[model samples]
Target chain A: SSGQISIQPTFSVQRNLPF
Target chain B: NATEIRASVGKMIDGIGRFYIQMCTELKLSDYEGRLIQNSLTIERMVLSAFDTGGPIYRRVDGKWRRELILYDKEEIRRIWRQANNGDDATAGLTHMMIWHSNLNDATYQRTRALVRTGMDPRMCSLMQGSTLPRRSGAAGAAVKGVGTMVMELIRMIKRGINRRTRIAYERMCNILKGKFQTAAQRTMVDQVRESRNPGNAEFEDLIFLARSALILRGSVAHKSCLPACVYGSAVASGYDFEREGYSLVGIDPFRLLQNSQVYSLIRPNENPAHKSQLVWMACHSAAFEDLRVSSFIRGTKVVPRGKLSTRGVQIASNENMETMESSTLELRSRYWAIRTRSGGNTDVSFQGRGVFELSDEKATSPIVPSFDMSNEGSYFF
Candidate 1:
């Protein structure tokens, strides 16, 4: 329970990284 | 390299193979879920065995006898399975359970197993006649072709076959996942499934029903064995787990619904994420690569040293920054996998994964492991 995620970690470092 | 042998087993072992490998690289979770995982290996053991070797039923579609609407239906499968369970003959019961779980219409993955070298008559290639099988269990009489007895012998052989192979598969998956995944991902995905699939027979040798079958959760584990039992088991036992949701009687009625549908459902994992992801990658890459000159940024690191092997001019000798750097700079590369999944003899069934990514660098990821939980429905990967 202590480690519950706030948002599903896309497991990404940066959201702005290009596709 | 053994495409032919793999094609023979289709994707039952293959799909599980992928799941077990991913779990091994993670730290063992310390929780009730972990404990459940510990027990599930026994279930997977029996189930896998039943699937690998139980003989199939082959009836010529054109022949009058083959037209019995009961051949591939879920209820037809349950009919034999029920008698076997009530009568104390697990062998026959398991036969029905195994063949029914195969996913035959998954066109893409099924091709992966087409190399098994089997005959192709529609009757011979189907669950009724797929793979090699006895034309008949024995003389059609009370003593021999009896419901429980016939399927029992076939399932017994399958159990033996699975016992011999699942352990090897479990360990093999652990090794492969270690090389491919981030340490945390490995710990959670690979080890958990392996333990579930390969926990030795000792733990379950005395448990009876639960002990005899090693449970492999596809979409979910709780309903897998319990639902089948409810559908066909005695009144007290039947409809126990899944009935709470009021999914309706899956027994003969669902069997009726299955009569003319081209696709059939069973409780088995049929494909690997890597393979399915890879297929999706290929499709996307094929579609877009003609213009996207995707080039690596300095091979693995930044600031290339002219044309040397890879840029190594700036080396961080300490572990302190590794975590931050990895997490901050790590890019997720999508992966895909496709495999002919287990569906008795449909040979066309497959598991598909569109895309999934893992943290590539070990530095940014936490080392603390998730406990393996067999009861946790979240662990299943399609």
Candidate 2:
């Protein structure tokens, strides 16, 4: 739904954060 | 659109950018407060050169007043800054970019303001960026009021403080009374501390705190150290066509450029060449009060002339009487010539024959011609 795409808050994962 | 204006403006921006980078490097590389503090000392000279371009432009347009700026007082620059507080539509510069154009475009001003906040706190950068811009909404497009409300505000600010009626009106509008300087009460204590700091230095006063406060306030503005705002800088350097000349910026009037008069007087054609008098004033009320030292950024510091035959250095020539100022017209002509030569990196020697002699093309074009009908011709028949 539109709700899932809007509120995904990617706050948990922490890593090298590659390009 | 105009080539001459383009080149001249480009030169102005580059010259000022050199100062910004120089100051930044010194701030990062060396512990030299004198370099940053004495910027205005050099700017005053550059300011006059900028005006020289304006003077001719006015003459070309056939304006009634040949004067480049009807008002050129150093105080007028401060008044402009105080009036044009926010680069946003909030403030405007008098005699700056036709008043209406002087306001920082809403988006641009917000960006600049955000940059300042971000510089101090990177975390809040994203938050502030979104919130900083003013919010406007309407169902039927955007409703607008009468045009040039901002322009009216700017003109009022510039002409207000100097004029009695305007000053009174502005004062009434703000409903605030003028307060005395911060040290109006602690004068004696401040003097005692300064005297104790230096036993032989009897000429110190409480005015240092006053001047320092003023300088700090002006430095808070973003993109002030650079020639113009970030957007303008990027556009010009990119070589993309824009609405106006890159350096035709409408913002804070440059004040640091007039920090001192010593270098200025040195370049002036009519300044008296008496070092003894320069010393006597410094000894008496102190250098801070002298036209050269007190009024300049290099106050309480030394400013020796550098380079080969710098007008500042010419007076102290082993041959003292060798140099004599002739006229303002001649002085301005030669000064611009010298500035061009100085800017040319020792390749293009001076036009009036003053500075270091370096190799240059004999068929070099005059600095004035660029765009416009005059430069369109390819060949001369006669």
Candidate 3:
């Protein structure tokens, strides 16, 4: 295993990106 | 671009498509997880196939089916995609425009097919009775009715064929993961539930059971294998060495892991000090995970009943640096897939559609939570 992740990735409520 | 009108009897073929199809068929996973998940499996095969030829592989709403977002590279669909600054490619050369189809509510479609096979009287058919089925008045009426029956009968053949393709596709992917994933207990969020509405289907491929898919993972894999399977497969498809890359997906319920949820991300540690390793956040839904499967997860896995699993059934982890991960988008762009090849009857009903699984270069600003293992039952894995 690589190093451990100390936190969680934030969930971005993307309103505009693509369909 | 390839040919020979190659027709085979079993759901076996080249590359990961054949491999994934086998796993899903064995587990009997299908639209059991719902359309989005099932469609993802198709996309997965495409990604793997792109490589095998080479390798190969959407998002949407709550309650409603999400619309399209990607189209074929050969077709001029500039405005339909309506992407930022009108760009079409998702992963540049890696991103591609393609289509995939799955069956839905086709009971009558198959029932008609069974009728035709038995050489039964066409008038006694539901097509002649249902108010919704258009009633016409003799030689003129009979001709039209006969024609309608033939159409429905033939349509059923295609539906059944396509449905079978997807079912095996699900099993194929499951087997891949079953081999890739670790232990079953290590496979926490790994789950799948094959369900049905009428609680039926004695025989006849009459859309027997409706299967919707979902996944919850407190799982792991190698750092080199960290990228989304799509990206990894595409890399190989484009000529990257598969053995040199060293890709291995560790355990989670094999077939259940193949459910192809709306969103899939690699949440473990990034092996590289350089900003990017294999960690990627990919979306398959046009609008991303909807509430339907969010709700469906409760039924598939043993959650809520015993209490809840976490704030969200699925989540990822990161270090304090928590470098922003690149994100991709997907959507159901409308498809008028050209009828180029003649298919008086698609012997391969099932394997085709038109759309895109475009991955754009965008970044997120907040909300990456802790890993699933850190959540509720971290101590249970004994």
Q: What would the per-residue lDDT of candidate 3 be over residues B30-145, giving only the tens digit for each residue?
A: 33222223233444434323322111112223432222333232222222222311242222112211111101111111233344453333222212111122222112111212
Clashing residue pairs found in predicted model 2? B3-B371, B40-B256, B40-B257, B40-B259, B43-B257, B44-B257, B259-B296, B259-B297, B260-B296, B288-B294
Docking class of 2: incorrect
lDDT, residue B80, model 1: 36
**Candidate models: Cα lDDT each:** 0.22, 0.22, 0.22
DockQ of each: 0.02, 0.01, 0.02
Candidate 3: CAPRI quality band: incorrect
TM-score, cand. 2: 0.18
Residue-level lDDT of model 1, residues B64-132, one tens digit each, is 111111113333333333333342333433332332231111111222133122111111111111122
Better of 1 and 3 by lDDT: 3
Native contacts, share recovered per candidate: 0.00, 0.00, 0.00
RMSD, each candidate, Å? Answer: 26.3, 25.5, 22.9
- What is model 1's interface RMSD? 19.1
Q: Could you tell me the lDDT of residue B59 within candidate 3?
A: 28
Task: Estimate TM-scores for all models.
Answer: 0.19, 0.18, 0.18
Clashes of each: 55, 10, 68
Once fitted onto the true fold, the runs of candidate 1 whose alpha carbons sit more than 4 angstroms away are A1-19, B1-45, B48-87, B103-108, B111-129, B132-252, B255-382
* Candidate with best TM-score: 1
- List, residue by residue over A1-19, the lDDT tens digit for candidate 3: 1111111111111111110
Which 10-residue window of candidate 1 chain B scores lowest in summed lDDT? Answer: B216-225
